[PDB]
Design a binder for this molecule. Structure first.
Ligand SMILES: Nc1ncnc2c1ncn2[C@@H]1O[C@H](COP(=O)(O)OP(=O)(O)OP(=O)(O)O)[C@@H](O)[C@H]1O
Lengths: 106, 42, 22, 199, 18
């Protein structure tokens, strides 16, 4: 009987990369990745957390962090179609049309 | 071909307000002996 | 009588204290 | 408030019971308090003796056999032991299938054989052999096989107390030496317990 | 060692003052 907590990351690939390996530097990246993996789902079980990640390079995230139970739902957002373009323009010109500041020939 | 860089981490030694604090606290008693000796010599 | 001061830091400033106290 | 699981010298506790309760009459079902090892114990009279008697006289040469209460952690060692007793046995009622683990029967069997086989047999055989015992075990495999689940379940499988958990690299800290302090603390409790209790 | 010397000195000074 608890509320909900929301955590939002940005550019998740910045801190999280292929665990170990790399061969260039192992300063604190390995420790950060291991700590995140353990805390998010370790021995103890939590049921009041939700995690949202955003990225532009899906293939670089660590696989161990993408297996089911940690990050299951994955979404690819594609370019909108013609109907999407029409809807976007309508949404962004509704305010203009509200005060009839748009010419009738548009 | 030879071109490399690096970045290093720094340390703060070991002063965690337990050894520092214990020495600081224990140094209170000495004032009592100072006062007692001064009273004795007066 | 076995010691008079614990060494918070391993510096010379502590040593003489003991002897001094002694 | 003073519960304890340390072993008790049954011969000595019975002797002290007799000494403190000599020249006294005890009846079936009687409840009293006995002080042993500077600890108070609630003793309930169960049976007397061979012809059974409802009320008897406790004397010096009388012997007493103590049985632990249900679900109690009281560990009684020696020969003055009656009824069902289980405090130090590598094979408890633990079931391998109630936990809901998957198809790792061979791995679990190998784990048991290679790890807990040594402690099952009496001390006589191991002492005659004069060999040490394993102190390490390592798992590895592809993600999401059940390593964490298997390890925690083994943590409960043994007839021992709760284990300690080291969640990731929490040991590291900026203050040098403090990591050594934490690891030393991690092992200090077990070291002291073994030193106190001997073999 | 600390207690032995400290209380010994305290007793000595107390008897002196008495
Ligand atoms: N054999 C199995 N049977 C049932 N559930 C399993 C099994 N293996 C894994 N799971 C499920 O995996 C979930 C989380 O993974 P788990 O902790 O078991 O993985 P792990 O083996 O410790 O690996 P890692 O932590 O490296 O991903 C648990 O909730 C458990 O439901």
């Amino acid at each position: 009987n608890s509320g909900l907590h929301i955590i939002i990351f940005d550019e998740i690939d910045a801190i999280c990369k292929q665990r170990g390996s790399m061969a260039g530097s192992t300063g604190v990246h390995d420790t950060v990745v291991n700590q995140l993996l353990s805390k998010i789902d370790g021995v103890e079980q939590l049921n009041n957390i939700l995690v949202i990640g955003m990225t532009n390079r899906p293939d670089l995230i660590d696989e161990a962090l993408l297996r089911p139970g940690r990050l299951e739902v994955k979404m690819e957002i594609g370019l909108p179609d013609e109907k999407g373009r029409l809807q976007i323009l309508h949404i962004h010109t509704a305010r203009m049309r509200g005060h009839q500041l748009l010419s009738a020939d548009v | 071909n030879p071109a490399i860089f690096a970045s290093g981490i720094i340390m703060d030694s070991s002063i965690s307000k337990q050894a520092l604090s214990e020495i600081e606290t224990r140094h209170s008693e000495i004032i009592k002996l100072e006062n007692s000796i001064r009273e004795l010599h007066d | 009588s076995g010691g008079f001061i614990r060494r918070v830091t391993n510096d010379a400033r502590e040593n003489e204290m003991d002897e001094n106290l002694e | 408030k003073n519960i304890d699981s340390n072993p008790y010298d049954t011969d000595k506790m019975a002797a002290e019971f007799i000494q403190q309760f000599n020249n006294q009459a005890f009846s079936v079902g009687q409840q009293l308090v006995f002080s042993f090892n500077d600890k108070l114990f609630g003793l309930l009279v169960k049976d007397i003796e061979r012809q059974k008697i409802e009320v008897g006289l406790v004397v010096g040469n009388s012997q007493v056999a103590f049985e632990k209460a249900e679900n109690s952690s009281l560990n009684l060692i020696g020969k003055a032991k009656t009824k069902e007793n289980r405090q130090s046995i590598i094979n408890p009622d633990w079931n391998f299938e109630k936990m809901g683990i998957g198809g790792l029967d061979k791995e679990f069997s190998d784990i048991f054989r290679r790890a807990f086989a040594s402690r099952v047999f009496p001390p006589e055989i191991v002492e005659q052999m004069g060999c040490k015992h394993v102190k390490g075990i390592l798992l590895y495999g592809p993600p999401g096989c059940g390593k964490t689940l298997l390890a925690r379940q083994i943590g409960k499988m043994l007839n021992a107390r709760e284990p300690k958990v080291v969640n990731g690299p929490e040991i590291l800290n900026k203050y040098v030496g403090e990591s050594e302090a934490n690891i030393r603390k991690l092992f200090a409790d077990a070291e002291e317990e073994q030193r106190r209790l001997g073999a």
